[PDB]
Design a protein that fits this description.
Chain B: Belongs to the ATPase gamma chain family. The structure is cut from a larger assembly and holds chains A and B. By secondary structure, chain A is mainly α. Chain A is 91% helix and 0% strand. Chain B has a two-stranded antiparallel ribbon. The chains are: A mainly alpha, B mainly alpha.
Chain lengths: 77, 57
């Protein structure tokens, strides 16, 4: 009935917003690391590890959104 | 005149402007380049003026 038709739309919009936010934030974080590595390569691993540290926090909420969209689509239907 | 040593001196003429110095090459410099404040050009002007002043001193 209408239930699944609306639930697929809800999962689609939630996961789309999550993907947009995660992709743009990770791209900015990566671009700053790229400029910092271009400036002086002797600090590349240090900036690359702090990049992992920050990127860990970046994906926090987007992955909650992704998981709840998956739940809506696959268990609520 | 140039102080070659205690016993000998020589009159000489050398160019200041334009900069006659032969070119040089490097990798470390301009790869780990200087941050320029405010901008690289005004610093180059002041640097050249101070350099010729030091040469004449």
């Amino acid at each position: 009935n209408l239930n699944m038709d609306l639930l697929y739309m809800a999962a689609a919009v939630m996961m789309g917003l999550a993907a947009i936010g995660a992709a743009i934030g990770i791209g900015i974080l990566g671009g700053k690391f790229l400029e910092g590595a271009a400036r002086q390569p002797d600090l590349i691993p240090l900036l690359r590890t702090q990049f992992f540290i920050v990127m860990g926090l970046v994906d926090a909420i987007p992955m909650i959104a992704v998981g709840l969209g998956l739940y809506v689509m696959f268990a609520v239907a | 005149n140039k102080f070659i040593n205690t016993m000998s001196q020589v009159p000489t003429i050398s160019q200041l402007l334009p900069l006659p110095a032969s070119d040089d090459d490097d990798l470390k410099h301009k790869s780990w380049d200087y941050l320029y404040e405010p901008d690289p050009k005004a610093l180059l002007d002041t640097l050249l003026r101070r350099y010729v002043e030091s040469q004449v001193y």
